[PDB]
Amino acid sequence: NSLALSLTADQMVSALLDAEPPILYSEYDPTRPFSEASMMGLLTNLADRELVHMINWAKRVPGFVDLTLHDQVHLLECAWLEILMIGLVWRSMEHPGKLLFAPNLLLDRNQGKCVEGMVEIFDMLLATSSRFRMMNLQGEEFVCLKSIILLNSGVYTFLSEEKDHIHRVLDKITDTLIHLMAKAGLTLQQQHQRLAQLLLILSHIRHMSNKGMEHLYSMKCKNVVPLSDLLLEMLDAHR
Amino acid sequence: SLALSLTADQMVSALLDAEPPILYSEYDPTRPFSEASMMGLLTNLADRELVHMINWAKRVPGFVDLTLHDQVHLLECAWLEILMIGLVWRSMEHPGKLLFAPNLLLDRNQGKCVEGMVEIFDMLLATSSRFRMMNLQGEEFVCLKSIILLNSGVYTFSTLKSLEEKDHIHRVLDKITDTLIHLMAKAGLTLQQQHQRLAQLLLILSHIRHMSNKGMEHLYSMKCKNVVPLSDLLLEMLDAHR
Amino acid sequence: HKILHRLLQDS
Amino acid sequence: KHKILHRLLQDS
Numbered sequence: 001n002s003l004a005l006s007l008t009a010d011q012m013v014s015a016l017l018d019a020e021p022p023i024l025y026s027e028y029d030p031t032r033p034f035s036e037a038s039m040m041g042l043l044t045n046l047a048d049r050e051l052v053h054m055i056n057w058a059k060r061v062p063g064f065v066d067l068t069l070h071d072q073v074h075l076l077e078c079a080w081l082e083i084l085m086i087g088l089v090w091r092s093m094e095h096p097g098k099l100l101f102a103p104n105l106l107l108d109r110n111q112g113k114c115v116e117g118m119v120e121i122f123d124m125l126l127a128t129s130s131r132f133r134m135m136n137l138q139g140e141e142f143v144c145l146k147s148i149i150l151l152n153s154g155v156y157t158f159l160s161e162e163k164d165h166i167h168r169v170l171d172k173i174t175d176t177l178i179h180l181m182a183k184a185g186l187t188l189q190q191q192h193q194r195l196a197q198l199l200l201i202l203s204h205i206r207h208m209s210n211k212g213m214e215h216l217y218s219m220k221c222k223n224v225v226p227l228s229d230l231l232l233e234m235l236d237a238h239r
Numbered sequence: 240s241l242a243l244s245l246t247a248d249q250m251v252s253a254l255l256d257a258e259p260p261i262l263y264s265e266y267d268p269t270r271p272f273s274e275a276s277m278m279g280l281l282t283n284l285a286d287r288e289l290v291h292m293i294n295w296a297k298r299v300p301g302f303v304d305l306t307l308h309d310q311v312h313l314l315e316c317a318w319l320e321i322l323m324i325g326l327v328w329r330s331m332e333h334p335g336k337l338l339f340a341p342n343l344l345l346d347r348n349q350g351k352c353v354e355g356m357v358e359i360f361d362m363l364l365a366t367s368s369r370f371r372m373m374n375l376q377g378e379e380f381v382c383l384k385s386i387i388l389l390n391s392g393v394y395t396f397s398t399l400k401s402l403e404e405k406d407h408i409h410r411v412l413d414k415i416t417d418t419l420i421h422l423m424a425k426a427g428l429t430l431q432q433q434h435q436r437l438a439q440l441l442l443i444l445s446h447i448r449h450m451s452n453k454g455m456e457h458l459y460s461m462k463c464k465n466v467v468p469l470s471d472l473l474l475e476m477l478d479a480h481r
Numbered sequence: 482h483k484i485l486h487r488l489l490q491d492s
Numbered sequence: 493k494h495k496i497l498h499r500l501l502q503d504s
């Protein structure tokens with residue numbers, strides 16, 4: 001039996017909030033004109049450090065610890081870029097037209113031009129951020145959506161009881177989301193409508209990850225920007 | 240607009256009545272199939288399905304109210320997703336097999352006839368297996384398929400008039416959500432079960448997008464590899480994603 | 482212009 | 493197989 005299923009909705013919210021990773025900083029070199037190699041270096045360095053904190057946060061997601069090691073590996077291998085992106089989108093909400101990669105690394109779509117094929121991913125990220133802004137996405141909802149991505153993105157790729165537990169945890173997070181919306185005063189119809197709107201954005205986040213993964217793969221055999229072994233192994237699992 | 244004035248039952252009826260037919264393949268069981276013939280059978284089938292899909296989309300409530308350019312954009316981004324959820328749906332009663340056509344029923348071993356096609360086959364079989372475990376209903380399938388058409392390109396579009404076009408799409412999307420909830424309450428589910436099944440159904444669209452992304456890349460690698468000729472319409476849809 | 486464009490507007 | 497991710501999850 002899993003302890004995560006015994007949690008109430010409030011206890012689930014507080015566990016997810018308490019597990020939030022910290023906001024990291026980028027290099028403080030203020031050389032303003034970015035080159036392709038310099039910008040991708042900053043983002044690669046930042047992303048590799050965020051990955052380490054993502055693993056600590058995953059182990060703190062209710063139900064994640066009750067899975068085997070290989071299932072945890074599979075779920076994170078499949079979702080790591082999605083999870084990075086929804087975090088980037090979230091902390092970019094209060095900065096319309098910009099992406100807050102770090103408090104000291106705030107970029108617009110013009111700066112995406114420094115890297116080939118990056119402006120398309122920026123525009124999608126900016127579009128998701130604006131969509132989160134227009135819905136007044138709340139932090140309690142954000143931590144639910146991010147956990148859903150972790151458990152859901154890889155659960156259909158368990159090829160050859162464990163998946164039954166993940167879906168039971170996913171149902172818990174759903175109950176937690178509805179509980180958050182009823183607590184915010186939304187009617188029954190507004191509740192399921194908002195539930196649907198939030199979950200449909202995950203399909204777009206998945207789309208963005210797939211485009212981002214191809215962009216990272218092409219940078220690998222460009223060999224211009226060196227990639228950490230951890231990123232190479234996360235990247236390698238998508239082929 | 241008529242889409243916002245439809246009841247839940249009227250929404251389901253309009254969607255069911257618009258269903259496209261199940262098309263046959265030119266599959267010759269005597270013939271041996273190489274890579275180039277299977278992908279020719281699949282490409283031929285997909286190209287004829289695209290024609291029905293286009294005329295199916297016109298009968299989706301709210302789709303006609305969009306501008307012609309918006310209709311093009313939505314179908315261009317969602318077409319493979321719609322083909323795949325349709326294929327997954329009609330394959331529910333055939334575990335371990337994908338029913339591309341009533342006469343073309345393939346397993347993963349035959350999927351190995353094309354390089355890299357195996358991974359996409361397994362993901363489709365898993366999705367069909369998930370629909371079977373969930374006992375997905377025809378009324379829910381047509382809802383999800385219309386959600387894909389309206390949702391997959393909405394983020395990828397500016398003015399006060401173009402905002403009212405995205406606003407209308409989200410109004411239709413909410414109408415379909417009300418329709419799904421109407422279906423689940425009619426089946427005897429409680430409020431907790433209704434929201435749980437709604438989440439379970441919409442989270443599958445994430446995996447369908449993933450399959451479409453992967454399948455799109457495999458079609459691109461085919462167009463260069465140059466061995467299997469694509470139809471003119473399929474090449475225009477393929478160029479829309481790049 | 483596009484094939485999809487023509488079929489969509491085709492009546 | 494050897495994976496850095498194996499070590500990070502065990503030392504979390």
Ligand SMILES: Oc1ccc(-c2ccsc2-c2ccc(O)cc2F)c(F)c1
Pocket residue numbers: 040043044045046047048050084085086087088101121212216231
């Ligand atoms: O915390 C984050 C760091 C980087 C990104 C991001 C966005 C587009 S590519 C990209 C990226 C990811 C991994 C990486 O190694 C390099 C990158 F540019 C993000 F979405 C979140």
Ligand SMILES: Oc1ccc(-c2ccsc2-c2ccc(O)cc2F)c(F)c1
Pocket residue numbers: 278281282283284285286288322323326339359454458473
């Ligand atoms: O009605 C359908 C026909 C083909 C597919 C399918 C599945 C994997 S590739 C693939 C495909 C699509 C277009 C095409 O031209 C060739 C293909 F192999 C489908 F999902 C639905």
